[PDB]
Amino acid sequence: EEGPQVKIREASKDNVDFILSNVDLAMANSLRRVMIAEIPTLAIDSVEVETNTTVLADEFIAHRLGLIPLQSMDIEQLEYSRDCFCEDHCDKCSVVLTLQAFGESESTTNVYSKDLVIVSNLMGRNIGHPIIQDKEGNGVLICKLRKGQELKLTCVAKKGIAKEHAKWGPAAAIEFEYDPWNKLKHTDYWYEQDSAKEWPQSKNCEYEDPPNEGDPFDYKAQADTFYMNVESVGSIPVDQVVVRGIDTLQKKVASILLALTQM
Amino acid sequence: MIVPVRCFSCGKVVGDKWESYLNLLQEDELDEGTALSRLGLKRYCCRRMILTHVDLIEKFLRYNP
Amino acid sequence: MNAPDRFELFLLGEGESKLKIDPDTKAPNAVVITFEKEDHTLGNLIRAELLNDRKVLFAAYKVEHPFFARFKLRIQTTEGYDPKDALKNACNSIINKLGALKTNFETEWNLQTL
Amino acid sequence: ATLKYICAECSSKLSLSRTDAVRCKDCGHRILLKARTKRLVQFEAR
Amino acid sequence: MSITETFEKPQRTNTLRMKHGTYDKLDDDGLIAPGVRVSGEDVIIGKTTPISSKRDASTPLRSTENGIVDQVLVTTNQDGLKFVKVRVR
Ligand SMILES: [Zn+2]
Ligand SMILES: [Zn+2]
Ligand SMILES: [Zn+2]
């Protein structure tokens, strides 16, 4: 469809190894940054501690809670708490969850993220569900209790972005490479005896044509064709991270044309 | 204290693989390296996260008060 | 304690506008736009695009201090060509370019088996 | 109802004022802990 | 002789000797309880002293510090004195 060009190599519920082509490095890189820091998501951002006899401090547990990946499928149908016209929080802008655990058995009692319970009305939108990916349906191990120890909390999820705090980040890592063959000469290889022999060859060198001995430096060739690979943290489908990233960046660029308008 | 929820460097959820790492060692008698790799942890930043953890809560739990 | 809030990185404080346009004196047909609550993501993007336009004599961006979230965009264009227009042409060219990418992706994503 | 002070070892809830010495019941320990307040504490999950 | 000190909430009487802090967090036993958040120059240990009616002898939290009361201990010395230890997290 003319313009940017996607060419997926791998795909799954966790990673999207693809190949952006026919685009400026800037755009490629801008998208890379947006996926990392500006894609809306839901995450614990308030914890009320009623009972805590655990070996961990409140802020310690609180901190971890906020790091628990939460379902953010329909995150767009959840207003930012700072915008919402209510007082503090409500179902229109926040998801409330509870955690109640008691050291009953004699063996250590594990408090996972599955033990979290939504207490607010989700209104039918896929949101707030603690993400689970372990072959045991336990999820993230929040804390541990000895017989007698108790923990009664109340978390208030909220929509946020990574820029404000990494917890709100939907992405994990983002492989990024271009010109596996240093034809553009964007880098000067360090060596002892042999540049090529000492430097490991990249995966993407296969997906490209090795330079030819005689050909003089192609001083016009620019930087297009970037070999990426996104990895979702779970709060959002892998493909979504990309798509929504592309969309978010698109919004920013638009928020500026609108500024020129009312200017 | 306990398995950090995410890896400091990339954020990849790692705080949901402690018990698995442990079993992969005792029950399956696998070596640390071969174990972390089977947990999807390929980049040394995530690998170190688990391989270097110290589950001090176990000893903490050993107190009564 | 002295550290500013995190939202200030993307939220405009009171008495602030997303764009500040001023006439450059060092040269004709030049402007210096101050983008508030934005960083390298936009600066280098709109910058790279403004460069594809041949009727654009000058385009550069810089964040004067990493503590604050804002950057300056300076543009120079041929007589008759308004700099505020090159920014429009660039923005639109981006939005379109990105839109096409969003489509090409949601397509290739379908032809996948996993 | 209530639980002003708590014992260090037996963890048995105590509660007394002045002239009431500074011990606990059964356990002659003289430590005692303040016991967490009821006013719920809020936290930034950051 | 008969000149003791008492852990409690002082609110001025014939002396007006207190400090620029805020005793609004001490319980009647003159001690904040675990869970309470303390900062600024708040009073952690309110105490009085009648010199021969109320002269402030209370321990305020450190200035450039601020956290949450992690624990309070009320013991007795080897002689018999009443001891107080407030751990702030
Ligand atoms: Zn609301
Ligand atoms: Zn990592
Ligand atoms: Zn006792």
In DSSP notation, A180-206 reads SSTTS--S----SS-HHHHSPPPGGGT
Residue E56, token pair as written in the block? 């402030």
Domain B1-65: which CATH number of 3.40.50.1970, 1.10.10.60, 3.40.30.10, 2.60.120.260: 1.10.10.60
Residues E73, D33: C-beta atoms closer than 8 Å: yes
Instruction: Report how far residue B8's alpha carbon sits from residue C24's, in angstroms, rounded to the nearest whole number.
Output: 44
Rounded CA separation A247/B3 (Å)? 35
Residues recorded for chain E: 89
H-only helix segments in C20-82: 40-50
Touch D-A: 3+ C-beta pairs under 8 A: yes
Pairwise CA distance, residues E84 & E75, whole Å: 6
Q: Are A192 and A109 within one domain?
A: no
Fold of D1-46: Rubrerythrin, domain 2 (2.20.28)
C71's enclosing H/E stretch is strand C70-77
DSSP state of E55: B
Say how many C-beta atoms besides its own lie within 10 A of residue C70's C-beta: 16
Domain containing residue A204: CATH number: 3.30.1360.10
d(CA A136, CA A158): 27
Expressed as residue numbers, the domain containing A129 is 41-166
Q: How far is CA A120 from CA A74, A92, A129, A157, C34, in A?
A: 16, 10, 12, 10, 42
Between chains, do A141 and B10 touch, taking CB under 8 Å as contact?
no
How many domains does one find in chain A? 2
Tokens representing residue E8 in the block? 């409690």
Position A138: which residue type? N
* Best CA proximity match to C46, nearest among C69, C12, C71: C71
Q: Is A93 annotated as a binding residue?
A: yes
The rounded distance, in Å, linking the Cα atoms of E76 and D18 is 13
Inter-axis angle of helices A25-37 and A238-262, nearest 10:
100
How, if at all, do strands C19-23 and A226-232 pair? Answer: unpaired
Instruction: Give the C-alpha separation, A234 to A68, whole Å.
Output: 10
> A32 phi and psi, to 5 degrees?
-60, -40
Domain C-terminal end among A131, A166, A201: A166
CA separation for the pair B10, A232 (Å, rounded): 11
Residues sharing a CB contact under 8 Å with residue C57, sequence separation 6 or more, in sequence order: C29, C76, C77, C78
Which helix (H) or strand (E) segment holds residue A218: the answer is none
Judged by its nearest atom, the ligand closest to the C-alpha of residue D28 is: 3
- Residue A243 in contact with residue C106, Cβ under 8 Å? yes
Same domain? A251 vs A214:
yes
Q: Which residues pair with A70 in a beta bridge?
A: A130
**Eight-class DSSP state of C55:** T
Residue C7 is classified by DSSP as: G
Q: Which residue has the tokens 């005689």?
A: A214
Check if the beta carbon of residue E38 is closer than 8 Å to that of residue E88. Answer: yes
Q: What DSSP state is assigned to residue E24?
A: G
Collapse the DSSP code of E67 into the 3-class scheme (helix H, G, I; strand E, B; otherwise coil) and give the result: strand
> Do A80 and A189 lie in a common domain?
no
Kindly state whether residues A19 and A110 are assigned to the same domain: no
A84 annotated as belonging to a binding site for a ligand? yes
Nearest chain B Cα to A133, which residue?
A: B16
Mutate to test the interface with A, among C39, C109, C110, C111 (most CBs of A within 10 A): C109
Which residue in the set D36, D42, D46 is minimally distant from A48, CB to CB? D42
Q: Are A39 and D22 in contact (CB under 8 A)?
A: no
Top residue of E36, E66, E87, E89 to mutate, by most chain A CBs within 10 Å, is E89
Please give the Cα distance from A140 to A112 (Å, whole number).
6
Q: Which residue type sits at C85?
A: D
Question: Chain E interface, mutation test: which of D5, D17, D33, D34, most E Cβ atoms within 10 Å?
Answer: D34
Contact (Cβ atoms closer than 8 angstroms) between residue A115 and residue A153: no
CATH of the domain at A137: 2.170.120.12
Three-point CA angle C107, C113, C114, nearest 5°:
105
Nearest one of A254, A223, A220, A240 to A27, comparing CA atoms: A223
**Shortest CA distance to A169 belongs to which of A231, A105, A215?**
A231
Kindly report the length of chain D.
46
Query: Are residues A148 and D12 in contact, defined by beta-carbon separation less than 8 angstroms?
Result: no
Q: What order of strands is seen across the sheet that includes strand A150-160?
A: A116-118, A94-102, A150-160, A41-52, D41-43
Structure tokens at E5: 């000190």
Answer whether C91 sits within 8 Å of A11, measured CB to CB.
Answer: no
Q: Among residues A107, A133, A166, which one ends one of the domains?
A: A166
Chain gaps in chain D, named by the residue before each (C–N > 2.5 Å): none
Contact B13 A234 (CB under 8 A): yes
As beta bridge partners, residue A144 has A110
Question: At CA E19, angle to CA E18 and CA E22, rounded to 5?
Answer: 105
Residues A118 and A126: their CA atoms lie apart, in Å, by 12
Spelled out in words, what is the top-level CATH class assigned to the domain C1-114? alpha beta
Measured CA to CA, the distance from residue E74 to residue D5 in angstroms comes to 9
Q: Which two tokens stand for residue A119?
A: 């207490």
Q: CA separation (Å) from E7 to D5, E44, E58, E84?
A: 15, 11, 8, 10
Q: Which residues surround ligand 3, an ion (CB under 5 A)?
A: D 7, 10, 24, 27
Helix orientation angle between C83-108 and C40-50, rounded to the nearest 10 degrees = 110
Among candidate residues C83, C78, C92, the one with its CA nearest the CA of residue C33 = C83
- Candidates B10, B12, B57; nearest CB to A144: B57
Of A95, A32, A27, nearest to A241 (Cα)?
A: A32
Beta-bridge partner residues of A155: A47, A97
**Residue E31, number of CB atoms within 10 A of its CB:** 24
Are both A250 and A195 inside the same structural domain?
A: yes
All residues at 6 or more sequence positions from A27 whose CB lies less than 8 Å from its CB, including other chains: A4, C45, C48, C94, C97, C98, C101
Domain locations in chain B?
A: 1-65
Are residues A134 and B20, on separate chains, in Cβ contact within 8 Å? yes
Contacts of A26 (CB under 8 A, 6+ apart): C44, C45, C47, C48, C49
Specify the fold of E1-89. OB fold (Dihydrolipoamide Acetyltransferase, E2P) (2.40.50)
Same domain, A147 and A87: yes
Burial class (CB in 10 A: 0-12, 13-18, 19+), B64: exposed
Q: How far, in Å, is the centroid of ligand 2 from the Cα of A18?
A: 21
Report the sign of the C-alpha dihedral through residues A55, A58, A62, A65, in that order. positive
The answer, for A249 touching chain C at a CB cutoff of 8 Å, is yes
